Every structure is written in structure tokens, then in C-alpha cells.
Design a protein around this ligand. Structure first.
Ligand SMILES: *[C@@H]1O[C@H](CO)[C@@H](O[C@@H]2O[C@H](CO)[C@@H](O)[C@H](O)[C@H]2NC(C)=O)[C@H](O)[C@H]1NC(C)=O
Ligand SMILES: [Ca+2]
Ligand SMILES: [Ca+2]
Length: 272
């Protein structure tokens, strides 16, 4: 395993957002041309084992641990999000769950601040939204998914999302009901795994839904806000109620928030 390996994301110009938004309220539109300097992205979501190295080194106590609760999906114990006492990264469904059998799955119940701590510890940083989206698209222009426009290309599952009737029944057709190992499923064109689905991913940007069509260089998002941007969707997402496993999709949370479907990966200007 090299679950902290990074890949070089090439310098380029891309179309961020879309002129055919699927969730208009989220400011997926307008499409705009964005220039991104060459940089490095983690191939994988940060795993339990990798976060454990951080905690072992630093003694870091996550915000969920200090608060004493975190959000868990009802189906693995909105109305289906319950604040569970004692749910945190070591106990993803609450006090009597464990990570011992899933060391290579993405770390969960990490806040934005927790993610910034990790990435900086590791000689890295969070990606910007624009860097994240560019990387997600994996060298393809104006496609829905990292791999193209078909959800199951060649009849194959390419990401860990939901199959079945949400929230009652997750069939586990794609091989995983909950999270999957961070190295599951095919890589995209840049060598990134689970950039859509599995765990949601924090980015560095403050959230806004108001974007200009002006061309920008290495944009950082708005200078202020109350919520940070997360991307990519999760194992919970289904077309029937969600549809956020598209590179253009975007959602938000307050920086002290944590949940059983939200993780992160890091980026860096140069190799640490
Ligand atoms: C985090 O630290 C713990 C405690 O030191 C590590 O677990 C120990 O590792 C040693 C060395 O392999 C073993 O001999 C012990 O049996 C382990 N102790 C316990 C209580 O489990 C753990 O491996 C570290 N985590 C990571 C990801 O490196
Ligand atoms: Ca699944
Ligand atoms: Ca993911």
C-alpha cells in the first residue's frame, strides 16, 4: 500500500461548473474557464490507517470527539441523519462500532478543521474547489463523471454510490453498502480513486452560489463565508434524491461539521 501517494495533476485550462446544471440551487452554473497550475493530488481519500499515523504522531483530538457526537446515517445504526453520541472516526456508527476491520477505508467524522490539521501535518493542504473539480474531471471536457457520461460504462460499476430504494434498501450491487477501501474502483485519467462517491471530500473554499463567467487563474473562492465547499458525493448518493456524484456538483457544511459519509484528500504545490 502507498495510501499517501500523490499524483501530478498537469497544468491546464478547464471548464468548471456547467451550463446545464442538474441542481440549480447549488450554483453548478455558469460554466467558466479556469486555469490551474501544475500541482499534486492525493491518489486516494485519506484512510483510517493514514489518519491514525497523524493522531499517533500529534495526539490530535478531532472536533467530533470534543463535541461528543457526530452525524450518522440511520440505515447503518434530514430525518435519516441522526446526531449520535460517541460517533467519531474510530467509531463510525457510534460507540460500539470499530474501524479495526476497515483500516483501508476512508476516514470519516472529520471536520474541515480536522482535515486542514491532517493535510498540514503531512506537508500538504486541502485542494481548492477548482483544483478538486479539474482533478475529478480527469482530462475530459464537460462530462458528467470522471470517466464520461455513462454511469455504468461497459456495464461496470465505476464508483461507490447507492443502488436500490433510498433510504430503505441499499442493494450493495456495486460491492459496498457502506464505504469501500480507498483504492477500490478504477482510477480516472489522472490516477485518482473514488473522487466521486465513497466519502464526500472537503475543499479549502468558502461556499458561494454566485459565480462569474470571467476567466480566472488558480481561483480560491470567495474571501468570506460561513460554510466550506465539499465535493464528489458519497456511498449514500442515488439519482432519485441526490445526484451529487458528478464533478460539477457541489455542497457545503460549516467547518466544524462532521458526518459518517464525509472525508477528504490532500493536495500540494510540490512533493512533500
Ligand atoms: C498507532 O500507535 C499504536 C500504538 O503504538 C500502534 O499499535 C501498536 O503497534 C506496535 C508496533 O507494531 C505493536 O507491537 C502493538 O501491538 C500495537 N499496540 C496496540 C495497543 O495496538 C499502531 O499500529 C499505530 N498506528 C499506525 C497506523 O501506525
Ligand atoms: Ca455502494
Ligand atoms: Ca470520494
Amino acid at each position: 500500500l502507498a495510501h499517501s501517494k500523490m499524483v501530478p495533476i498537469p497544468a491546464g485550462v478547464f471548464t468548471m461548473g456547467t451550463d446545464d446544471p442538474q441542481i440549480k440551487q447549488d450554483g453548478e452554473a455558469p460554466a467558466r474557464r479556469v486555469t490551474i497550475d501544475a500541482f499534486y493530488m492525493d491518489a486516494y481519500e485519506v484512510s483510517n490507517t493514514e489518519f491514525e499515523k497523524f493522531v499517533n504522531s500529534t495526539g490530535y483530538l478531532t472536533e467530533a470527539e470534543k463535541f461528543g457526537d457526530s452525524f450518522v446515517f440511520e440505515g447503518m445504526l434530514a430525518p435519516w441523519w441522526l446526531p449520535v453520541k460517541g460517533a467519531n472516526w474510530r467509531h463510525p456508527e457510534g460507540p460500539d462500532s470499530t474501524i479495526l476491520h476497515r483500516p483501508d477505508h476512508p476516514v470519516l467524522h472529520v471536520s474541515w478543521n480536522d482535515a486542514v490539521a491532517y493535510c498540514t501535518w503531512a506537508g500538504k493542504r486541502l485542494p481548492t474547489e477548482a483544483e478538486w473539480e479539474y482533478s475529478c474531471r480527469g482530462g475530459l471536457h464537460n462530462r458528467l463523471f470522471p470517466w464520461g457520461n455513462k454511469l455504468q460504462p461497459k456495464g461496470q460499476h465505476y464508483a461507490n454510490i447507492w443502488q436500490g430504494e433510498f433510504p430503505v434498501t441499499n442493494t450493495g450491487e456495486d460491492g459496498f453498502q457502506g464505504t469501500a477501501p480507498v483504492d477500490a474502483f478504477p482510477p480516472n485519467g489522472y490516477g485518482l480513486y473514488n473522487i466521486v462517491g465513497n466519502a464526500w471530500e472537503w475543499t479549502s473554499d468558502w461556499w458561494t452560489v454566485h459565480h462569474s463567467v470571467e476567466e480566472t487563474l488558480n481561483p480560491k473562492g470567495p474571501p468570506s463565508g460561513k460554510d466550506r465547499v465539499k465535493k464528489g458525493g458519497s456511498y449514500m448518493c442515488h439519482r432519485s434524491y441526490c445526484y451529487r456524484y458528478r464533478c460539477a456538483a457541489r455542497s457545503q457544511n460549516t467547518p466544524d461539521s462532521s458526518a459518517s459519509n464525509l472525508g477528504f484528500r490532500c493536495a500540494a504545490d510540490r512533493l512533500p
